[PDB]
């Protein structure tokens, strides 16, 4: 995937990390709101603080690559049964939105992703994929 894409599909994916019920079961009481958020906040804050290096890495490795920007004919709807340089630009700019952000204050991003990640209102959409049960 690399960027987005799974947001399409014959039933789209949830972008927030799959903090489903078993993954967080490994958090020994006080799941998510304990050590997990604290670690997340430090990491996210650092990335926001330095910023430029992240964009640099992506920009160099994919400055003028031979990389394919989204293959659809053999993917996504492939599992169903019964732009050019503009895409590069558009996708890379989304990085700048996740970095820095508009919600600001760090915590706000972390809290938002968590609610989205665990809310069954979104989980109860997905076809198989990880099959968020078991």
């Amino acid at each position: 995937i690399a960027f987005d894409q799974g947001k399409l599909l014959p039933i789209p994916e949830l972008v927030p990390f799959r903090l489903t019920r078993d993954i967080v079961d490994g958090f020994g009481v006080t799941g998510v709101d304990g050590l997990f958020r604290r670690s997340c906040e430090r990491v996210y804050a650092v990335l926001r603080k330095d910023y430029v290096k992240v964009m640099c890495v992506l920009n160099i490795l994919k400055w003028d690559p031979l990389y394919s920007w989204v293959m659809s004919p053999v993917k996504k709807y492939e599992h169903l049964f019964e732009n050019e340089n503009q895409e590069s630009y558009r996708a890379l700019k989304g990085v700048e939105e996740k970095l820095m952000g508009n919600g600001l204050s760090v915590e706000s991003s972390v809290q938002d992703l968590i609610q989205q990640a665990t809310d069954p209102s979104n989980l109860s959409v997905i076809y198989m994929g990880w099959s968020p049960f078991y």
Binding site: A2, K53, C56, V57, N59, I60, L61, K62, W63, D64, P65, L66, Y67, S68
Partner: protein, 454 residues
């Protein structure tokens, strides 16, 4: 943080008030004061009041430039301690360039000073080059994206329309005469901004290049920045001939984090850019065989199949040509010691992937190698280059030795299989180490598309 550091910056002032009275040595006490002023300027800058460090540094610099007593035997003590402090005006200038730009109160006037610093030759000059390079990049991009460059379109529109309607002068040639004069001024201005763009760029490259020659403290960041500026402007001789001439100075053999993106750009053209691109490639192939050869052998395997693209055909010849030249460069195909084996290994691996589709209802297919020729290959490769693991030369060092040489073993065994397709046996039999045991699972799928994300 400053909440602590400022206390000492303050103390230093208290402790130097009478240095002229501790001993009668004008030739050193003035130097001591310079140190103290510098130190506090930085302590302040780190917090707030950017206005103060800049004045401190501007005045300190001017005073140091006005050394007056540019040299003296000075006290023997001064000589003894000379290397313990000094100052380095080159460093002071750097700090002025930065102090004047962090706030906007200097526009780009910095350039009037910038060109003048011819630095020194020891250490810490790498900080100086680094900052100068960062400042040139910011200016180059601010200009590149400026409306002033975009404005060329307006000048073009005026040229197309005024040349018709005003030229027709259906209703004064006197007014039309202004079109030529103003148009010529517009053209000269557009030319001029493009020239500045190139000068900022060239010098930025020069400074990053120099930084990479003398230090390894933050080269981890510089190399990406350098690559960017170079690949960003793969156009004229103004940048590329100079790099061809200077880029060969890089004492290291790094670039590795994106060697795949270097090698893939090699093609056949008479142009600059391609020349130093190819030159760099040879530099690395010659000195660090195995760390470059896997990507080369990989592309050659790729190229031989589905040879439909016009670009792949060109790539084949470009790569093949270099590889043949490399055995020439080796001495007498000395490098055959690596290439023949690498080619054989790559071909064997390709065969294993192709042979993965052994069918049967089984999930084994062992009998050691049985028909596999790896049995011979593990022995022929009595000094086998390392597939993966974790290995580096840091910068240069020596890429001719690795633990993996003692990997002349295979542990040929049953293949992994489970879900999609089929895979190889872990095999490996490690080396000096007792691990490895990593199997292949060839198919097609994403290939390069996954590797790049990793």
């Amino acid at each position: 943080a400053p909440q602590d550091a400022l206390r000492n910056a303050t103390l230093m002032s208290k402790t130097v008030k009478n240095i002229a009275k501790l001993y009668d040595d004008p030739s050193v006490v003035s130097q001591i004061e310079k140190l103290a002023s510098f130190t506090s300027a930085n302590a302040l800058w780190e917090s707030r009041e950017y206005k103060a460090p800049v004045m401190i540094m501007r005045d300190l610099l001017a005073q140091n430039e006005k050394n007056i007593s540019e040299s003296i035997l000075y006290d023997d003590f001064k000589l003894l301690i000379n290397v313990p402090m000094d100052q380095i005006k080159a460093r002071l200038v750097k700090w002025s360039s930065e102090s004047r730009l962090e706030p906007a109160a200097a526009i780009y006037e910095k350039i009037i000073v910038n060109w003048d610093i011819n630095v020194e030759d020891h250490e810490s000059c790498s900080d100086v080059f680094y900052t100068l390079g960062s400042f040139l990049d910011e200016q180059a991009q601010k200009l590149r994206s400026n409306g002033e460059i975009e404005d060329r379109e307006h000048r073009s529109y005026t040229g197309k329309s005024t040349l018709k309607a005003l030229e027709l002068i259906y209703k004064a040639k006197r007014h039309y005469n202004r079109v030529l004069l103003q148009y010529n001024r517009d053209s000269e201005v557009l030319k001029a901004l493009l020239l500045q763009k190139e000068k900022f760029l060239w010098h930025a490259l020069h400074f990053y290049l120099n930084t990479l020659v003398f230090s390894n403290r933050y080269d981890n960041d510089i190399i990406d920045k350098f690559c960017g500026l170079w690949f960003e402007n793969d156009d004229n001789s103004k940048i590329n001939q100079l790099l061809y001439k200077e880029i060969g100075t890089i004492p290291s053999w790094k670039f590795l984090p994106w060697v795949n993106q270097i090698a893939s750009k090699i093609s056949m053209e008479e142009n600059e850019f391609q020349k130093p691109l190819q030159l760099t490639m040879k530099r690395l192939l010659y000195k660090l065989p195995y760390d470059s050869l896997y990507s080369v052998m990989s592309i050659l395997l790729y190229e031989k199949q589905s040879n439909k693209d016009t670009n792949i055909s060109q790539k084949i010849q470009a790569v093949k040509k270099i590889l043949l030249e490399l055995q020439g460069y080796d001495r007498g195909a000395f490098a055959k010691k690596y290439l023949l084996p690498v080619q054989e290994f790559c071909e064997m691996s390709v065969e294993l992937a192709n042979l993965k589709f052994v069918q049967n209802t089984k999930t084994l297919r062992l009998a050691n190698l049985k028909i596999g020729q790896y049995w011979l290959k593990q022995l022929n490769m009595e000094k086998l280059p390392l597939p993966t693991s974790n290995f580096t030369v840091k910068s240069s060092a020596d890429g001719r030795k690795a633990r993996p040489y003692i990997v002349s073993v295979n542990e040929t065994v049953g293949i992994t299989t489970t879900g999609l397709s089929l895979p190889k046996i872990v095999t490996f039999n490690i080396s000096d180490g007792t691990t490895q045991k990593a199997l292949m699972k060839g198919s097609n799928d994403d290939l390069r598309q996954d590797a790049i994300m990793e």
